[PDB]
Structure 1
């Protein structure tokens, strides 16, 4: 099955998921000089004060911090979005080295990691139905660079010992996603896709201009995770990012002048 290795990685995905070569695939390079400021964009609203985290899961390609999405408790609205999108989970993509790891690039620059806060359009009733829709999802993407520690990340870092291998999960209640956000909500936005199989073209991407900083030791613990299940040969969970895909005649919009 699909992975990030030489034999099952991004170059292979198209054979099982033909949409890999579609018209609105993600991630993309954000060419900052080609991006246009959009005055019709409303202010971005991130409402995570009532957020209810439940669990953290190693799914064999990254780890998901899952939330209770049965009521409007953590929501994303405004910006390019019509209606309300509920937070279901967040996860990261990272590299084997600090000079790579992000999925989106900015003027071809790769960051050490990228955080994805995944949201589904409430008019569609659940996540499964939302991913059948062109505007089913909204993913808020945040770049990670190496520098000072992110205090709001440490609770995540510390539990990774407990979910080392594929299929392992751990209780992860009372985690506050607000501690993962940068100061500014300035962003780029474009229509795109899931960056992993099934690569469904359902996402409004909202990628924040301001990266967060994480410490070397925080990122190092990400790299100690395993792609494999327990009792199988160890394959370090690193370089779980898809490279930039063709923009194809889509326009990236900026929230800022």
Structure 2
């Protein structure tokens, strides 16, 4: 099935998922000089104080930290969004080397990794209905660069040894995603898609300008995960990023002058 290799990677996805060549695909290069400051954007509100994580899972493509989204607990609102969007999971994309790994780029610059906090529009009742809607999802994207360690990431790093291979999962309660956010909430926003199959065009992207720093040791631990399942030949989980896709005349808006 789909993946990140020569015979099943991004350049192949369109055969099973023809929307891969659609009009609002992600990620994109963010040309900072062409993005326009928008005064109509309201302040961005990230309210993660009551977030309740449940579990972490290796799905053969990345790892997902899942949240109990049955009550309004961890919500994103404001900015380009109408109403409230509820956090359901986060995951990362990263490289085999520090000079690549992010999905969005900034004036063609690639970061070592990118964090996606996935939220669904509460107007639609749950995630599954939300991904049938052009305003169903909001994904908060955060770049990672290699430098000083991110202490709030260490709990994730330390659990990865227990979910090395595809299909493994572990209990993962009391994880605070506030520990993964940079100081500034300045952002770029544009309409796009999921960056993995099924590549659904339901996302309002909100990409923070300020990266977080993580240590070389932290990202090296991400690169020790496996795409394959237990008892299968080892394929390290690296380069699980889709490259930038055509903007197709969409407009990227900036929240900062």
TM over 0.5, yes or no?
yes
Where does 1:175-214 land on structure 2 (aligned, <5 Å)? 175-214=175-214
Give 1:17 deviation, angstroms: 0.3
Give 1:225 deviation, angstroms: 0.1
**Which residue number in structure 2 is paired with residue 252 of structure 1?**
252
> Aligned equivalents of 1:78 and 1:154: distance in 2?
29
Give 1:29 deviation, angstroms: 0.1
Give 1:159 deviation, angstroms: 0.1
Give 1:176 deviation, angstroms: 0.2
> Aligned equivalents of 1:218 and 1:96: distance in 2?
13
Give 1:245 deviation, angstroms: 0.1
Give 1:220 deviation, angstroms: 0.2
Runs of 5+ in structure 1 lacking a partner? Answer: none
**TM-score normalized with structure 1 length:** 1.00
Give 1:151 deviation, angstroms: 0.2
**TM-score normalized with structure 2 length:** 1.00
Runs of 5+ in structure 2 lacking a partner? Answer: none
Instruction: Name segments (4+ residues, structure 1) moved above 6 Å.
Output: none
Which secondary structure state, in structure 1, belongs to the residue aligned with residue 11 of structure 2? coil
Give 1:96 deviation, angstroms: 0.1
Give 1:94 deviation, angstroms: 0.1
Give 1:146 deviation, angstroms: 0.1
> Aligned equivalents of 1:246 and 1:23: distance in 2?
8
Give 1:120 deviation, angstroms: 0.2
User: Across the two proteins, how many residue pairs are aligned to each other?
Assistant: 257
Give 1:64 deviation, angstroms: 0.1
Give 1:5 deviation, angstroms: 0.1
> Aligned equivalents of 1:232 and 1:133: distance in 2?
38
Per-residue Cα deviation, 1:156-196 (whole angstroms, up to 9, x for no partner): 00000000000000100000000000000000000000000
> Aligned equivalents of 2:50 and 2:215: distance in 1?
28
Which secondary structure state, in structure 2, belongs to the residue aligned with residue 109 of structure 1? coil
> Aligned equivalents of 1:39 and 1:195: distance in 2?
28
> Aligned equivalents of 1:58 and 1:105: distance in 2?
25
> Aligned equivalents of 2:34 and 2:249: distance in 1?
12
Give 1:86 deviation, angstroms: 0.2
Give 1:82 deviation, angstroms: 0.1
Which secondary structure state, in structure 2, belongs to the residue aligned with residue 8 of structure 1? coil
